[PDB]
Paper text:
The high-resolution structure of LucY comprises 302 amino acid residues and displays a three-domain fold in complex with the FAD cofactor, similar to the previously published structures of related MurB enzymes. Domain 1 (N-terminal residues 1–83 and C-terminal 297–302) consists of two α-helices and six β-strands forming a four-stranded mixed β-sheet and a two-stranded parallel β-sheet. Domain 2 (residues 90 to 215) is formed by a five-stranded antiparallel β-sheet and three α-helices. Domain 3 (residues 235–288) contains a three-stranded antiparallel β-sheet and two α-helices. The binding-pocket of FAD is formed primarily by domains 1 and 2, with additional contributions from domain 3 and the loop connecting domains 2 and 3. One copy of the enzyme was observed per asymmetric unit, and the structure belongs to the trigonal space group R32. Interestingly, three crystallographic symmetry-related protein molecules formed an apparent fifteen-stranded β-barrel-like superstructure. Thus, we conclude that the fifteen-stranded β-barrel is a feature of the crystal packing instead of a true trimerization interface. All three magnesium ions in the structure are bound at the surface of the protein and appear to mediate crystal packing between symmetry-related molecules via interaction with the carboxylic groups of Asp 42 and Glu 286, amino groups of Lys 41 and backbone carbonyl groups of Lys 41, Glu 286, and Lys 287. Moreover, LucY, the brightest of the MurBs, does not contain a Trp or Tyr residue within 10 Å of its FAD binding pocket.
We have discovered, cloned, and characterized a fluorescent flavoprotein from a Geobacillus species that is homologous to other bacterial MurB enzymes. In the case of the Geobacillus-derived MurB homologue, FAD fluorescence is enhanced more than 10-fold, making this protein useful as a fluorescent fusion partner. We have named the novel MurB homologue LucY, for Lucigen Yellow. In a physiological setting, MurB catalyzes the reduction of uridine diphospho-N-acetylglucosamine enolpyruvate (UNAGEP) to UDP-N-acetylmuramic acid via a hydride transfer from NADPH to the substrate through FAD.
Author numbering: 1 to 302
Write the structure that this text describes.
């Protein structure tokens, strides 16, 4: 990978960080080294990076805030592209917002709601990036990205860039086409909001932020909800009903207030988290005969 790293440095793509700990780049603050973590300074830099990747035929993964990732302790091979400050453009034109994939979702929800534009209040507590929200079809409070997205600009591995419409994104619960048929990087999105009375929109937005304070981790690092809900049961309630809140393995524990979040109490390894996940699964399978599946994404090594 030495030469991949070199070409990237020569292209001035932005930061080119060798053996970079993914613990620095995930909300749960866990994870080993990426061989090469690139932090592109702009959209062209992302294209330049992907072309190097294509040439040397190495592995790539795009990340935003790492808010749904449990990266394993031996990190990630190949190139990791973090979309962040280099891709944080944001412009409002009437009821349409055009926003780079690196922009903070919480920031967008906060500022857009303050403009009286309704449709992003639901996202005020989703601590990811726009590109990751598009990839995940992120959702809360009965809404999601699919309700407001007009189109998304995708960079494919082969270097082609294409605007996919809402329908072409094939959104469903926690799902988009980037996860399956058409993998690629979301560089930019156009979102459609609705102009309404500002104060009520701001209120809803803040209400949703308060909801996070009352029911979910604040003091400890954590990733997104761990398990899919085995409907009509909720994973969190099953875990709580089995008395596993606060249950600890190593530095990892089930949060004290929410059964579906594992927090990094301090010093947690990926192994701790994985063990905890398996232990919760065993416990719920024994008690309820339910096999729970992960929603949090496990990445690294393989
Ligand atoms: C406390 C907490 C609360 C959360 N609450 C919610 C919630 O209510 N609803 C919800 O849906 N999620 C929630 N999440 C999960 C997470 O915030 C979202 O899934 C978010 O959309 C992920 O963004 P990232 O930008 O954080 O993605 P990661 O950086 O976390 O990326 C996740 C996946 O998207 C891919 N990816 C990232 N960026 C791109 C890109 N630009 N192009 C293509 N692929 C990309 C990655 O490869 C990976 O597969 C929560 C997380 C935490 C920690
Ligand atoms: Cl950044
Ligand atoms: Cl906790
Ligand atoms: Mg240039
Ligand atoms: Mg027993
Ligand atoms: Mg029994």
């Amino acid at each position: 990978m030495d030469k991949v790293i070199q070409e990237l440095k020569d292209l001035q793509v932005g930061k080119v960080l060798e053996n970079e700990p993914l613990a620095n780049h995930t909300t749960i603050k866990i994870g080993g080294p990426a061989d090469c973590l690139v932090i592109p300074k702009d959209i062209q830099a992302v294209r330049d990076t992907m072309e190097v990747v294509k040439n040397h035929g190495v592995q790539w993964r795009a990340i935003g805030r790492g808010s749904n990732l449990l990266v394993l302790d031996e990190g990630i091979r190949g190139v990791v592209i973090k979309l962040g400050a280099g891709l944080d453009h944001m412009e409002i034109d009437g009821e349409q917002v055009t926003v780079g994939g690196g922009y903070s979702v919480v920031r967008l929800s906060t500022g857009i709601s303050k403009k009286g534009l309704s449709g992003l209040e639901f996202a005020s507590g989703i601590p990811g990036s726009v590109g990751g929200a598009v990839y995940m079809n992120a959702g809360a409070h009965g809404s999601d990205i699919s309700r407001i997205l007009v189109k998304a600009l995708i960079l494919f591995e082969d270097g082609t860039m294409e605007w996919l419409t809402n329908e072409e994104m094939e959104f469903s619960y926690r799902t988009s086409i980037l996860q399956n048929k058409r993998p690629g990087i979301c560089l930019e999105a156009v979102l459609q909001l609705e102009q309404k009375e500002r104060d009520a929109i701001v209120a809803q937005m803040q209400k949703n932020k308060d909801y996070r304070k009352e029911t979910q981790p604040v003091s400890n690092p954590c990733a997104g909800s761990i398990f899919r809900n085995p409907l009509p049961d909720h994973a969190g309630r099953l875990v709580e009903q089995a008395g596993l809140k606060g249950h600890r393995i190593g530095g990892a524990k089930v949060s004290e207030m929410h059964g579906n979040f594992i927090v990094n109490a301090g010093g947690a390894t990926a192994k701790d988290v994985l063990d905890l996940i398996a232990f919760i699964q065993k416990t719920i399978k024994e008690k309820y005969d339910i096999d729970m599946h992960t929603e949090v994404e496990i990445v690294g090594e393989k």
